[PDB]
């Protein structure tokens, strides 16, 4: 509350560390469905169904330009990528499996880097 604060966690490396995670997600062999925004002209149903499209290149530009206020807003966008994927793709599909794999890969890096 006013003039009552928990001890100050060092957040000075968070930007660099999110960048490293994101590089590791970019270079994963199963990243290919997620590298670029879904082409809304060429994929019927995407625009109407997926209310907030998100992809790794868009996260990279947001990260690089100071549009994440803290590491939690960064994780919310990464998770959005996988939540969108599950919304649109059957589990038993190459893309559906890719999204589960990448979400797992992310969540472990997230826990190991920050928890």
Curated annotation (Swiss-Prot):
Domain Bromo: 9-113
Cellular compartments annotated: Nucleus
Tissue specificity remark: Expressed at varying levels in several tissues, whereas a smaller transcript was expressed specifically in testis.
Subunit structure: Component of the BRF-1 ISWI chromatin remodeling complex, at least composed of SMARCA1 and BAZ2B, which regulates the spacing of histone octamers on the DNA template to facilitate access to DNA. Within the BRF-1 ISWI chromatin remodeling complex interacts with SMARCA1; the interaction is direct. Component of the BRF-5 ISWI chromatin remodeling complex, at least composed of SMARCA5/SNF2H and BAZ2B, which regulates the spacing of histone octamers on the DNA template to facilitate access to DNA.
Function text: Regulatory subunit of the ATP-dependent BRF-1 and BRF-5 ISWI chromatin remodeling complexes, which form ordered nucleosome arrays on chromatin and facilitate access to DNA during DNA-templated processes such as DNA replication, transcription, and repair. Both complexes regulate the spacing of nucleosomes along the chromatin and have the ability to slide mononucleosomes to the center of a DNA template. The BRF-1 ISWI chromatin remodeling complex has a lower ATP hydrolysis rate than the BRF-5 ISWI chromatin remodeling complex.
Family: Belongs to the WAL family.
Protein name: Bromodomain adjacent to zinc finger domain protein 2B
Full-protein positions shown: 2054 to 2166 of 2168
């Amino acid at each position: 509350s006013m003039s009552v604060k928990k001890p100050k966690r060092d957040d000075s490396k968070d930007l660099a560390l999110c960048s490293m995670i994101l590089t590791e997600m970019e270079t994963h062999e199963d990243a290919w469905p997620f590298l670029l925004p879904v082409n809304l002209k060429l994929v019927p149903g995407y625009k109407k169904v997926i209310k907030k499209p998100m992809d790794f290149s868009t996260i990279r530009e947001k990260l690089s330009s100071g549009q994440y206020p803290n590491l939690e807003t960064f994780a919310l966008d990464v998770r959005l990528v996988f939540d969108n994927c599950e919304t649109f793709n059957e589990d038993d599909s190459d893309i559906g499996r890719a999204g589960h794999n990448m979400r797992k890969y992310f969540e472990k890096k997230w826990t190991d880097t920050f928890k």
